[PDB]
């Protein structure tokens, strides 16, 4: 299930495409926070799928201080809390021997600050979508099984459309009204 | 990330070769490129044994002499085939038999041709063949011929009318021509094969191809299925489709080659994809140690070595009984106990260990059982109830509040409990298959391969016995997180085994698959340990590789390029094997037929001679892996019919006459004169053609010839009477004949006094020498002999006495052949040679073959 | 067979992989005995059987 | 390749001190000669190796 689409559409929907695990092949035409210790970052990455960096005495930076509430929420062990507060004491001593720390302690604050949205409660299928690749290259026009069109234009889209319409058995979809991105996402969901 | 048929094949060769190179002898490497082998075999399959021509090759040519009324007729067949093969020597039988094989190959090569679209012209409303279609070369003698003979020649040309004849319910043009007997025999055999095939063979082959396409989910164009029913097309079936698999499997010790070719020819290409990122990393319910892993990631990218190991795991999974895993521990690569302790968990789900077949050795079963025992007893974040059994074996305990005995999870190959083959019907037979030797249907976890699935929703809420029991046991022990993780991963597991089952049942069906009888005996042989058949290949694997394999899947992107054209390759391979077998049989029979003159040799000699001439692609295919096994294979009665075999047997039958090969032993010696013409009336001498040859019209009369051999000559030389006896015989103008050694004959044409070496050469050589105090002597016979023809050219200038030497010049060697090589005939019978019947297809007619339709 | 029945699976494979080397060695021994060590000083058949 | 011939040079006189077809009983009739025969055979026929 391989689809061809205008380049601006994939450019605008790259985030959703990455979130739904479809690989992107496109041709162009012309401060973060860190966790005190690696264990908490690993736990939060496992829970939410969000990559988190680790503080390594680099520069005056902004530190995230996970609080007792989220410590209990994430199921963190006693040793993790102990090492977190040990690193906290080390930071206290370092800044007393003359960096900003935030004691985030609500789940919504952490979500609205950084990271990916939590997981829904449905059965997990083998794959999120039935499509593997959406591309905008003439080099793999024979690779495609269907294509999508929009009133928006690309300098190479006309030739690709001509070379794709020549296929004997290919599914063709066109969008005329509403939002192009919403229609494309609905199509990629139902295809 | 990506995989393909050829790439996995190369990896398999590398692994097997590295395993086998560990032990070698005699203290005396390369991995062949499967791409080159596949390309060569496909090209060989695309080759045509026959060839289509508009005009047959010239059979008779004429050399014009000074005479206006006489001319010589030369048979082109004999004058050219003498250059086929090198010289013969009696010390090396292998080269002699290689020359014999080349000579018999040449006849079959020359005799296979088809006439089509002959150029003709109309005359008086009747079609008359043009002067080039008939196989003569009389144009060179025309300019000297007189008017009245030339008119007869023209009238004979006018008589070459063309008639019509019906062949296979089709009208073809029939006419008369000239050709040599050995070539005409092969031409007639080819024609008869063409008529014979049209009855039933083609329809059966097309039906079998249709059935194979039906099973393997292959759709063929109408040009392959219904194009043979046209009335304007002849299909010459050089290769027959329903090949019996016994021919392929009868070659000794070829299991590795068969498995490699099976992987290479029909394995689809695809990618390895991680599971849905909606499944988080598994968290272990263990009390925290300061350096242990809290969780084991699933999206992490493995190293190249781990990629090779997971490739090994998948390759052995896709071939149930032929490839087996084995653990390997590196001295370094420091690993936490958790990864091994959870690989021991996943091993009981990835593999089956009994019932019908096995994917793992007993050592792996014991190691996995020990790892599971350690996981179940030694891991706990809180106190857990446990009970112990009396016997001293792993997994003799009962764990949890409920009395869940873990004895069932101990591996037992006799019943296969605790693994995938737990109370499931893994093997079943439903209907006859396109290949009669492989009727079994494999089904992992009871999943049926007859129904298509969708990856998005398949596998939700469906379980098999082993997985359900393992989940119940795991949740009973109090490991909630691991149980939840394994429950979440179930649809991915089901989809992966669905894909694997589809690949095994649909694509890998070929002759190269292991037959049912050998497949059934794999497990009992491993249990008993009395290995007599080919042993299964064992591969090494690490602990982390089990986890990585459980956290990856194989998705076929698209089918193999050569999947559609496999049967033709299989048929051509079987046909070549059959041809080599029949060549060996005919060589043995020929050697037995004439022991007096043929050099005695061992089978390893002429088998090597045959292999020297076999196509390189077949040799490369068969050499991817004694004498007793060779004889056993030769004595087998299974043969594969083919056009090449049909022509080869006729060529071997025609090879029964050594004169057709121009190898002779009737070499005589007799002192004779070079003729000295009168040359008194030069015009009269020029009008009457004159020539001199070494040929004998008839063999010398009996009782006028003496018979010699090696031992007679040695006895004569023992007293010094050899040369004396020869001189006495020559002074008595008697004949002498040599024997034993088979000689080769060469034909040459001269126009003046020949070079001396052939003028006064001797077919034998004599020498003597002395070492120490004893006298010594040697005798030998020349193996190369020449036959020359002399044409005497005269001009008005020379005197009659010019061509009369003062003293005689003597020639010794003479040769007798019982067939006409060069004949002196008058211009009347130039076209009298036309006595053989030819059939030619019309220009609008089409010749087609199956390989052409598939566009090889 | 006895090694496999006794459960000594590890060394069974090692023994199985050694057959060609063993057979080559014994073939060389037979060649040397039958071909090179033949002389009048060789023991007669009767004393060999005795 | 050569085969011996029966010839006698007019200027040569032959002497043959030894007869070649040695009888094995002469060498094997000596009592307690087993070790002697073994040593002689292994000295005259046994080849070296690696």
Q: Which of B519, B321, B534 is nearest to B438 (CA)?
A: B519
With helix as H, strand as E and coil as C, how does C21-43 read? HHHHHHHHHHHHHHHCCCCCCCC
Q: Do B457 and A125 lie within an 8 Å CB cutoff?
A: yes
For residue B162, give both structure tokens. 């063309």
Q: Do A126 and B494 lie within an 8 Å CB cutoff?
A: yes
B19: closest CA of chain C, how far (Å): 10
Length reported for chain A: 191
For residue B253, count other CB atoms closer than 10 A to its CB: 10
Contact between B849 and B705 under an 8 Å Cβ cutoff? The reply is no
**DSSP SS3 for B86:** coil
Kindly identify which residue of chain D lies nearest to residue C37, measuring between CA atoms. Answer: D45
Q: Which of B30, B8, B538 is nearest to B308 (CA)?
A: B8
Mutate to test the interface with D, among C41, C42, C44, C50 (most CBs of D within 10 A): C41
Bridge pairing between strands B784-791 and B691-693: antiparallel
**DSSP SS3 for A122:** coil
Side by side, which strands form the sheet with A34-35?
A53-54, A34-35, A62-64, A100-102
Q: How far apart are CA B217 and CA B224, in angstroms?
A: 16
Q: How far apart are CA D34 and CA B485, in angstroms?
A: 81
Q: How far apart are CA B622 and CA B250, in angstroms?
A: 13
The H or E element containing residue A120 is none
Contact between B767 and B777 under an 8 Å Cβ cutoff? The reply is yes
Q: Left if phi > 0, otherwise alpha if psi is -120 to 50, otherwise beta: which for B355?
A: left
Q: Left if phi > 0, otherwise alpha if psi is -120 to 50, otherwise beta: which for B423?
A: left
Mutate to test the interface with D, among B26, B28, B718 (most CBs of D within 10 A): B718
Q: Is A62 on the interface with B (CB under 8 A)?
A: no
Q: How far apart are CA A127 and CA A125, in angstroms?
A: 5
- The CB-side HSE value for B741 (13 A sphere, CA atoms) comes to 23
CB-based contacts of D20, cutoff 8 Å, min separation 6: none
Contact between B508 and B262 under an 8 Å Cβ cutoff? The reply is yes
**DSSP SS3 for B122:** strand
Contact between B175 and B160 under an 8 Å Cβ cutoff? The reply is yes
The H or E element containing residue B91 is none
Question: Looking up tokens 């012209």, which residue turns up?
Answer: B121
Q: Which runs of consecutive H residues, i.e. helices, occur in A27-122?
A: 38-48, 68-73, 78-96, 107-113
Q: How far apart are CA B699 and CA D9, in angstroms?
A: 43
Whole-Å CA distances, B134 to B62, B81, B174: 15, 21, 12
For residue D27, give both structure tokens. 């060498």
DSSP B505: I
Kindly identify which residue of chain A lies nearest to residue B286, measuring between CA atoms. Answer: A77
Q: How far apart are CA B54 and CA B117, in angstroms?
A: 6
Q: How far apart are CA B612 and CA B712, in angstroms?
A: 38
CB-based contacts of B52, cutoff 8 Å, min separation 6: B113, B114, B116, B847
Q: Could you give the angle at the alpha carbon of B763 between the alpha carbons of B758 and B764, nearest 5°?
A: 135
Q: How far apart are CA B732 and CA B671, in angstroms?
A: 10
Query: What is the four-CA torsion angle of B143, B149, B151, B156, rounded to 10 degrees?
Result: -100
Q: How far apart are CA B631 and CA B633, in angstroms?
A: 5
Q: How far apart are CA B635 and CA B638, in angstroms?
A: 9
Contact between B153 and B139 under an 8 Å Cβ cutoff? The reply is no
For residue B730, give both structure tokens. 């020559």
Kindly identify which residue of chain C lies nearest to residue B537, measuring between CA atoms. Answer: C13
Q: How far apart are CA A72 and CA B497, in angstroms?
A: 39
Question: Looking up tokens 């990864």, which residue turns up?
Answer: B339
The distance in angstroms from the start CA to the end CA of chain C is: 34
Q: Is D18 on the interface with C (CB under 8 A)?
A: no
Show the beta-strand stretches assigned E in B362-513: 386-387, 398-399, 404-405, 427-429, 440-442
B709-724 burial: b if 16+ Cβ within 10 Å, else e: eeeebbebbeeeebee
Q: How far apart are CA B103 and CA B88, in angstroms?
A: 12
Kindly identify which residue of chain A lies nearest to residue B279, measuring between CA atoms. Answer: A124
B197-234 burial: b if 16+ Cβ within 10 Å, else e: bbeebbeebbebbeebbeebeeeeeeebbeebeeeeeb
Rg (CA), chain A: 24
What DSSP string describes A142-171? Answer: TT-SEEEE-S---TTHHHHHHHHHT-SS-E
DSSP B789: E
Contact between B276 and B240 under an 8 Å Cβ cutoff? The reply is no
Contact between C37 and B566 under an 8 Å Cβ cutoff? The reply is no
For residue D22, give both structure tokens. 């040695």
Question: Looking up tokens 């121009």, which residue turns up?
Answer: B662
Q: Is A39 on the interface with B (CB under 8 A)?
A: yes
Q: Could you give the angle at the alpha carbon of B716 between the alpha carbons of B713 and B695, nearest 5°?
A: 40
Contact between B509 and B215 under an 8 Å Cβ cutoff? The reply is yes
Q: What resolution does the deposited structure have, in angstroms?
A: 3.6
Q: Do D3 and B777 lie within an 8 Å CB cutoff?
A: yes
Contact between B705 and B722 under an 8 Å Cβ cutoff? The reply is no
Contact between A2 and A132 under an 8 Å Cβ cutoff? The reply is yes
For residue B689, count other CB atoms closer than 10 A to its CB: 19
Instruction: Please state how this structure was obtained.
Output: cryo-EM
Chains D and A touch (3+ CB pairs under 8 A): no
Q: Do A125 and B460 lie within an 8 Å CB cutoff?
A: yes
Q: How far apart are CA B182 and CA B298, in angstroms?
A: 73
The H or E element containing residue B154 is helix B147-158
B83-122 burial: b if 16+ Cβ within 10 Å, else e: ebbeebeeeebbbbbbbbbebbbbbbebbbbbbbebebee
* B280 vs A contacts (CB less than 8 Å): 46-47, 49
Q: Do B531 and C24 lie within an 8 Å CB cutoff?
A: no
- For the purposes of burial, counting CB atoms within 10 Å of the CB of B696, is it exposed (0-12), middle (13-18) or buried (19 or more)? middle
Strand partners, B827: none
Whole-Å CA distances, B327 to A87, B359, B552: 42, 13, 19
Chain pair C-D, CB pairs under 8 angstroms: 27
Bridge pairing between strands A53-54 and B705-707: unpaired
Length reported for chain C: 50
Kindly identify which residue of chain D lies nearest to residue C40, measuring between CA atoms. Answer: D24
Q: Phi then psi for B391, rounded to 5 degrees?
A: -70, 150
* D45 vs C contacts (CB less than 8 Å): 36-39, 41
Q: How far apart are CA B778 and CA D2, in angstroms?
A: 5
Strand partners, A173: A148
**DSSP SS3 for A99:** coil
Sign of the dihedral defined by the CA atoms of residues A160, A165, A168, A171, in that order: positive
Contact between B349 and B550 under an 8 Å Cβ cutoff? The reply is yes
Q: Do C36 and D46 lie within an 8 Å CB cutoff?
A: yes
Q: Phi then psi for B320, rounded to 5 degrees?
A: -60, -60
Q: Do D2 and B714 lie within an 8 Å CB cutoff?
A: no
Q: Do D14 and B773 lie within an 8 Å CB cutoff?
A: yes
Q: Which of A147, A135, A155, A156 is nearest to A175 (CA)?
A: A147
Q: How far apart are CA B370 and CA B341, in angstroms?
A: 9
**DSSP SS3 for B218:** coil
């Amino acid at each position: 299930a391989m689809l061809l689409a205008p380049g601006d559409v994939i450019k605008r929907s790259s985030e959703e495409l990455k979130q739904r695990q479809i690989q992107i092949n496109l041709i162009d035409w012309t401060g973060r926070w860190v966790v005190l210790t690696e264990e908490i970052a690993r736990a939060i990455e496992s829970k939410y799928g969000t990559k988190i960096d680790v503080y390594r005495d680099e520069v005056p930076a902004q530190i995230i201080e996970v609080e007792r509430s989220l410590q209990k929420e994430l199921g963190i062990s006693r040793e993790g809390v102990a090492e977190q507060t040990e690193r906290l004491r080390d930071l206290r001593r370092k800044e007393k021997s003359g960096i900003t720390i935030e004691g985030v302690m609500s789940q919504k604050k952490l979500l609205s600050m950084i990271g990916g949205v939590e997981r829904k409660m449905a059965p997990i299928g083998a794959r999120e979508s039935a499509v593997m690749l959406v591309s905008n290259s003439i080099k793999d026009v024979v690779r495609a099984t269907a294509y999508f069109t929009a009133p928006t234009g690309d300098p190479h889209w006309k030739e690709v459309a001509r070379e794709a319409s020549k296929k004997k058995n290919i599914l063709a979809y066109t969008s005329t009204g509403g939002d192009v991105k919403t229609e494309f996402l609905h199509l990629i969901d139902h295809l | 990330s990506s995989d393909s048929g050829p790439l996995l094949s190369v990896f398999a060769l590398q692994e097997i070769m590295q395993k086998v190179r560990q032990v070698q002898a005699d203290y005396m490497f390369t991995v062949p490129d499967v791409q080159k082998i596949l390309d060569d075999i496909k090209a060989l399959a695309a080759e045509q044994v026959y060839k289509i021509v508009k005009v047959p090759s010239i059979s008779f040519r004429h050399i014009v002499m000074q005479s206006r009324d006489r001319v010589l007729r030369v048979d082109t067949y004999y004058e050219e085939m003498s250059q086929v093969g090198d010289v013969i020597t009696e010390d090396e039988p292998e080269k002699f038999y290689s020359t014999i094989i080349k000579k018999v190959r040449f006849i079959r090569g020359k005799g296979s041709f088809i006439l089509h679209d002959i150029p003709t012209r109309d005359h008086r409303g009747m079609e008359v063949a043009e002067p080039e279609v008939l196989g003569v070369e009389f144009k060179n003698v025309l300019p000297v011929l007189t008017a009245e003979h030339r008119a007869m020649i023209q009238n004979a040309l006018d008589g070459s009318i063309i008639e019509n004849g019906n062949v296979a319910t089709r009208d073809v043009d029939v006419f008369i021509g000239a050709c040599s007997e050995p070539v005409y025999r092969i031409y007639n055999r080819l024609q008869g094969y063409i008529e014979a095939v049209q009855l039933q063979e083609l329809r059966n082959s097309i039906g079998w191809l249709e059935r194979l396409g039906h099973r393997k989910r292959i759709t063929y164009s109408q040009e392959v299925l219904t194009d043979f029913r046209r009335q304007d097309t002849i299909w010459v079936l050089a290769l027959q489709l329903p090949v019996n698999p016994q021919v392929v499997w009868d070659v000794p010790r070829s299991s590795i080659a068969n498995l490699i070719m099976n992987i290479a020819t029909c394995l689809p290409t695809g990618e390895y994809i991680a599971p849905n990122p909606r499944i988080s990393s598994i968290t272990l319910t263990q009390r925290i140690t300061t350096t242990g892993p809290f969780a084991i990631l699933t999206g992490s990218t493995p190293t190249a070595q781990q990629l090779n190991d997971v490739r090994k795991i998948y390759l052995a999974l896709m071939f149930p009984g032929q490839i087996i895993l084995d653990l390997k521990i590196d001295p370094g690569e420091r690993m936490d106990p958790a990864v091994r302790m959870v690989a021991g968990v996943v091993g009981h789900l990835l593999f089956t260990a009994g019932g019908r077949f096995t994917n793992l050795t007993q050592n792996m079963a014991r190691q996995l059982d020990i790892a599971l025992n350690d996981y179940l007893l030694y891991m706990y974040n809180t106190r857990v109830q446990v009970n112990y059994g009396p016997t001293g074996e792993p997994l003799d305990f009962q764990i949890g509040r409920n009395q869940y005995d873990c004895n069932v999870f101990r591996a037992d190959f006799a019943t296969g409990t605790g693994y995938n083959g737990w109370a499931t019907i893994d093997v079943e037979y439903r209907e006859p298959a396109p290949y009669v030797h492989a009727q079994r249907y494999i089904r992992y976890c009871g999943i049926d391969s007859r129904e298509l699935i969708n990856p998005t929703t398949y596998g939700i809420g469906m379980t098999y016995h082993c997985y359900n029991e393992m989940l119940r046991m795991l949740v009973a022990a109090g490991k909630d997180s691991e149980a939840a993780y394994f429950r979440s991963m179930l649809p991915f597991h089901m989809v992966r085994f669905a894909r694997i089952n589809q690949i095994i049942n649909e694509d890998l069906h070929s002759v190269f698959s292991l037959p049912d009888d050998m497949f059934n005996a794999l497990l009992p042989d491993l249990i008993a340990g009395a290995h007599q058949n080919a042993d299964p290949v064992v591969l090494d694997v690490s602990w982390i590789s089990l986890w990585f394999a459980f956290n990856r899947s194989f998705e076929p992107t698209h089918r193999n390029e050569m999947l559609e054209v496999a049967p033709l390759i299989e048929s051509v391979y079987a046909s070549e094997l059959s041809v080599m077998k029949v060549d060996m049989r005919h060589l043995s029979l020929m050697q037995r037929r004439f022991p007096d003159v043929l050099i005695q040799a061992r089978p390893s000699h002429f088998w090597k001679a045959v292999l020297n001439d076999s196509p390189e692609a077949v040799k490369a295919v068969m050499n991817l892996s004694n004498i007793r096994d060779m004889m056993r294979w030769v004595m087998l009665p299974s043969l594969q019919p083919s056009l090449k075999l049909a022509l080869e047997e006729e060529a071997w039958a025609a090879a029964n006459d050594f004169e057709d090969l121009m190898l002779t032993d009737q070499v005589y010696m007799h002192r004779d004169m070079l003729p000295e013409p009168r040359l008194d009336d030069i015009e009269r001498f020029r009008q009457e053609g004159f020539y001199y040859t070494n040929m004998l019209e008839a063999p010398p009369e009996i009782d006028r010839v003496v018979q010699y051999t090696y031992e007679i000559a040695r006895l004569q030389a023992n007293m010094g009477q050899f040369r004396a006896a020869l001189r006495r015989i020559m002074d008595d103008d008697d004949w002498v004949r040599f024997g034993g050694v088979l000689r080769t004959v060469r034909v040459k044409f001269y126009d003046a006094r020949p070079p001396d070496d052939v003028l006064q050469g001797l077919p034998f050589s004599y020498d003597t020498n002395e070492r120490g105090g004893l006298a010594y002597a040697t005798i030998k016979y020349a193996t190369e002999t020449t036959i020359f023809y002399l044409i005497y050219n005269v001009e008005f200038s020379n005197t009659p006495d010019s061509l009369v030497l003062i003293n005689p010049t003597y020639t010794m060697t003479k040769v007798f052949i019982n067939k006409r090589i060069v004949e002196r005939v008058r211009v009347g019978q130039i076209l009298a040679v036309l006595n053989r019947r030819f059939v030619a297809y019309k220009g609008k007619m089409r010749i087609m073959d199956i390989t052409q339709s598939l566009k090889m």
